[PDB]
Amino acid sequence: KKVCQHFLSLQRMFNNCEVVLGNLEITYLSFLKTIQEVAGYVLIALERIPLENLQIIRGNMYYENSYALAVLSLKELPMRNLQEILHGAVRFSNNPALCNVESIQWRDIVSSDFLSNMSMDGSCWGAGEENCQKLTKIQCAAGDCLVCRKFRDEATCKDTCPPLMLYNPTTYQMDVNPEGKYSFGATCVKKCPRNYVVTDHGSCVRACGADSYEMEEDGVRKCKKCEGPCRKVCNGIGIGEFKDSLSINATNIKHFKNCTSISGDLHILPVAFRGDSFTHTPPLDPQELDILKTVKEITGFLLIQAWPENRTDLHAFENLEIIRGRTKQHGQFSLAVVSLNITSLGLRSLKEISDGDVIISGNKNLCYANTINWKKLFGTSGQKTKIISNRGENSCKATGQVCHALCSPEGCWGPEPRDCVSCRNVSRGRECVDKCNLLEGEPREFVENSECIQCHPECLPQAMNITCTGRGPDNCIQCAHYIDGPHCVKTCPAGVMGENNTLVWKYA
Amino acid sequence: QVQLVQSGGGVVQPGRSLRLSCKASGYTFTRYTMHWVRQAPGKGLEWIGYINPSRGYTNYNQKVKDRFTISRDNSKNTAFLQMDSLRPEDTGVYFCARYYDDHYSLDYWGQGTPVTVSSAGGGGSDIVMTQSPLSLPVTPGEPASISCRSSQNIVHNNGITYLEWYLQKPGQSPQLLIYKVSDRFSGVPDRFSGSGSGTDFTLKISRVEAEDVGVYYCFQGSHIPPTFGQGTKVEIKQVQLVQSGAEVKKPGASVKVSCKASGYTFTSYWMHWVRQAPGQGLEWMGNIWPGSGGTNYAEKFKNRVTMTRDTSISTAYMELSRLRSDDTAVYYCARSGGPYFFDYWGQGTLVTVSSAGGGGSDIQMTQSPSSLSASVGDRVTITCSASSSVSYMNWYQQTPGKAPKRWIYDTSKLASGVPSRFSGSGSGTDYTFTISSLQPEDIATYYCQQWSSNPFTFGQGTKLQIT
Amino acid sequence: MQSIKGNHLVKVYDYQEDGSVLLTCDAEAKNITWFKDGKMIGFLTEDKKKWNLGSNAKDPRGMYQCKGSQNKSKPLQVYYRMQTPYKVSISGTTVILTCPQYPGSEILWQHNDKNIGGDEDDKNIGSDEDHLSLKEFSELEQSGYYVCYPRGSKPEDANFYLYLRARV
């Protein structure tokens, strides 16, 4: 059954659509005749339009508000099948050329939405008396229902398809459903068809790039939620639309909004914060530099030759995560903070300066720089630092701007425990505390691979021994809330799905 | 069959650069000298020069000696003609011809390529910054107002009307006066003010002193090429970038006027390099972000200028090669700014380049009659008088739309295929071409040519028609 | 070279049994008056007409010109090594010639009325602007009359020919 969402385009992309999961936006010849059931609205804007097979209007959108049947200014528009517009209201308005329509009532075709049922210009329905209204009410709606209330897999009417995942009390665990069925439109499919990618709600949609990301964890592409920023390459300074550009220009800063892996070389150069005259770029508002903070890789050479002075750390690249120098500025430098005014270099996560060497010079007020051990940062043996001319090391130590002693000897890119390459003790996420909440601590976490792992929150902290050994409430030692078999859980399963979607009482 | 193929012609805006190719076939390209000749609409043949493919030795007509460069590729049997700063006067059909030294004649001529030098869009090429007053002299303490109108809307996509009015005191570097349309440059006294919108803008000098005296020049900004306007010379009714010293070079030569820079990170402010023709306004010439050696050359000099820099020594060089007569200008080397273009400027390096007579005599040939109508069978006699004794005279036939063809060589020898009814005679400064019996196929233009001295000089051409 | 057309009436008598340089005057024999560097060096009243420059071992050199009843003929620059004239330089076995008049046009060279310096297929004969280079100069082969001329003009129209005799 073909599907769709200029007149020629819509007539070719709507002609054979046996069902359209989008909207029936027929605006402005007899190209539609077998549009069976539509999960959405119908923007009818035209005098002879068959539309005969239009059976169910779901109003999943509305023109302005509950406007499922928007009409205007079609006596031979025999919507005889248009018998039940569900979850919507009929805006059957501006019917000047419509005949045989006033005689037929306009209310039995909608249910419990007569409040928004406005219409203005037993009884036959459409053009030609051969058609009748065929009242059936005064779960089928189109008259083993022909059109189901919510989901009709093959012939049955079901409110909801068989889930892709069905709990296994045999595993004492909420498992997948062997009869797993994605709900394509209104029919359940074992395999998500139409090159459609499984979506969060399960209704495979052909586009879930919003607030999510596509994944392929099986033979079918799936849309996964966007972890932080999800991947979104953007051409960088030097390559692509900015190929001639000389910096992150202000007329260039915005287009990198939510740019994940800037593919060129970000090179924020002094003219930029100065703003340039010959290139016509207004001054980049110093707060706007926060845009690039979503950066998570910079496949080029980042020569950041000034940042706003009122900020004491290069906080704007506080997510730079690999600085692979596919090109290297002067072929020798990969991370090149040169003559800034930053207190600590502070690039809090850069843990693979892949290609070039790193020169961090001129930083007259950068102190935590020297203690960093750049060998673990360099990725190839030809990398060699030149971290020079910084703030005086002896003066730094005298002034006390030395790393938190809760930091391992490898150094630290900034004074706060956030900026420390590795810790003397283990770490609780970004920072690195003295001690995990092994017995005392509200988070009551668990140490894992020199890292504090906050417990499954559904687990009570324990005051005699360690609270929870490992991740997952299965690993939780204390669960004052209910515990599900050998696992702890929020609450017991009752409205669960079973062999035939049976509500598993489980235990009390 | 020897063949000369001209390619590369077309329409270009005046001042642009043009490169033509002449592929040689049917002979050893290196054994005969190659000459290029231009045929303008309505004018006779003009010799441009020659280049020896075996030696690379080239000679040029003085009128183009400084703007054209004659090149050739022995590996491709093609001669290259690089024409720069094209003027409307260069419009015409350009022809390449093979010189047989044995007959002292161009026996093989290419079909030619038409060149037309006209501006497709003058307004697009240069947002005409006409300024309403011109050399307005003003008594001190008066509310001066100088208006300039931009040929288009100066309203950039950013929406900032990137306008200024930079002043150059007599014998001093340009300095900026109004930061944008009505703001003020730090250090610019508020006595200056200005206003404008769309394409019309104007500057107000409420109080005028000796300081304000000078020329105020309105630069444009939204258009890609900065383009300085006519210039209203107001009369009466740290970082320092050092330019280099005054130099005089000769036509076709090159000057590298240096620009030493101190007080700013040289590789942190683009060192755009304006030029100020005597008797003409400023015109942006090119830029170079000293960091990376990028050049953004201007169209009017697009194939003649080369801007390099040594960030090491904190000096920026700019070698303008193939200098021409009108190139004499003082390359004020300013530092292109943040919100104000051309912020602080150098001393300026004047470079006056002049030429000599360059064979002004260009010993001339005169042909008579200019147009001749005769009946089929009539005897036609064409005379060619030389301003000076020429050892040998040549006659060339050009049918309309056809290249010149060698017809008579050595002042009496008929080219291969030339009918015996044509005859050439003469000596010294008098030569005659006689057609004993006119034929309809003889309708064409006849040009006499002297080769005793460069440049080759052609007679004006005799238009022969049949009544 | 061999021709006297162009008022190049002065030619060298290379019919000497001894290494003496005899000069001949192609004028209507009535009386030949000989000049050397503008100054007259002899006046032959009938009888003899050739001018003996002496033995070639003394390296005779100068611009020699004669005159019969007509005006002075064009000079013959003699340069033995055993108006601006042509410049001759010897360095080892290399003979280099400089054209006296080099207005910047393509200068062509001819040796005993035979063009030279044109083809690049000769490693020992190079033409560089107004300089013609003769490497491994052959006394018996490369000596004789030489002349430089611009493209388009006649060698006989040159102001004077050069007679070269050098032992290297």
Coordinates of all heavy atoms in Angstrom, one line a residue, chain A residues 53 60 90 103 158 173 191 198 200 233 238 291 294 307 323 370 382 392 395 430 447 473 485 504, unseen atoms left out:
Chain A
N53 N -12.5 6.8 -1.7 CA -12.0 5.8 -0.8 C -11.6 6.4 0.5 O -11.2 5.6 1.4 CB -10.9 5.0 -1.4
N60 N -4.0 13.7 13.0 CA -2.8 13.7 13.7 C -2.1 15.1 13.7 O -1.3 15.4 14.5 CB -1.8 12.6 13.2
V90 N -14.4 18.7 12.3 CA -14.6 19.0 10.9 C -14.8 20.5 10.7 O -15.8 21.1 11.1 CB -15.9 18.3 10.4
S103 N -27.4 18.7 2.6 CA -28.5 17.7 2.9 C -28.0 16.7 3.9 O -28.7 16.3 4.8 CB -29.0 17.1 1.7
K158 N -6.5 -3.5 16.7 CA -5.9 -3.5 18.0 C -5.5 -2.1 18.3 O -5.2 -1.3 17.5 CB -4.6 -4.4 17.9
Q173 N 13.1 -10.7 34.3 CA 13.7 -9.5 33.7 C 12.8 -9.0 32.6 O 12.2 -9.9 31.9 CB 15.1 -9.7 33.2
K191 N 9.3 -6.9 10.9 CA 10.5 -6.2 10.5 C 10.1 -4.8 10.1 O 9.1 -4.6 9.3 CB 11.1 -7.0 9.3
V198 N 13.6 2.2 13.1 CA 12.9 2.1 14.4 C 13.1 3.4 15.1 O 14.2 3.8 15.3 CB 13.3 0.8 15.2
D200 N 11.8 6.0 18.6 CA 11.7 5.8 20.1 C 10.4 5.2 20.5 O 10.3 4.2 21.2 CB 12.0 7.1 20.8
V233 N 28.8 16.7 11.3 CA 30.0 17.3 10.7 C 29.7 18.7 10.2 O 28.5 18.9 9.7 CB 30.6 16.4 9.6
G238 N 38.8 26.8 6.4 CA 39.8 26.4 5.5 C 39.2 25.4 4.4 O 39.7 25.4 3.3
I291 N 29.3 29.2 21.2 CA 28.7 28.3 20.2 C 29.6 27.1 19.9 O 29.1 26.0 19.9 CB 28.4 29.1 18.9
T294 N 30.3 23.0 21.7 CA 29.8 21.7 21.4 C 30.9 20.9 20.6 O 30.6 19.7 20.3 CB 28.5 21.7 20.6
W307 N 41.6 34.7 23.2 CA 40.2 34.4 23.6 C 39.8 35.6 24.6 O 40.7 36.3 25.0 CB 40.0 33.1 24.4
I323 N 42.4 16.1 18.6 CA 42.9 17.2 17.8 C 43.7 16.8 16.6 O 44.7 17.4 16.2 CB 43.6 18.2 18.7
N370 N 52.7 23.8 32.6 CA 53.9 23.0 32.5 C 53.8 21.6 33.1 O 54.3 20.7 32.6 CB 55.0 23.8 33.2
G382 N 56.5 11.5 16.7 CA 57.2 12.8 16.2 C 56.6 14.0 16.8 O 56.9 15.1 16.4
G392 N 56.0 32.1 35.2 CA 57.1 31.5 35.9 C 56.8 30.3 36.7 O 55.9 30.4 37.6
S395 N 57.6 31.1 40.2 CA 56.6 32.0 40.7 C 55.3 31.4 40.8 O 54.5 31.7 41.7 CB 56.6 33.2 39.7
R430 N 33.6 14.3 36.0 CA 34.5 15.3 35.5 C 35.5 15.7 36.6 O 36.7 15.9 36.3 CB 33.7 16.5 35.1
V447 N 33.2 2.6 43.3 CA 34.4 2.8 42.5 C 34.4 1.8 41.4 O 34.1 0.6 41.6 CB 35.6 2.7 43.4
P473 N 20.7 -1.8 39.0 CA 20.0 -2.1 40.3 C 20.1 -3.6 40.6 O 19.8 -3.9 41.8 CB 18.6 -1.6 40.1
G485 N 12.1 -9.9 42.0 CA 12.8 -11.2 42.0 C 14.1 -11.0 42.6 O 14.3 -10.5 43.7
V504 N 0.9 -9.3 33.9 CA 1.5 -10.2 34.8 C 1.4 -9.6 36.2 O 1.9 -8.5 36.5 CB 3.0 -10.4 34.5

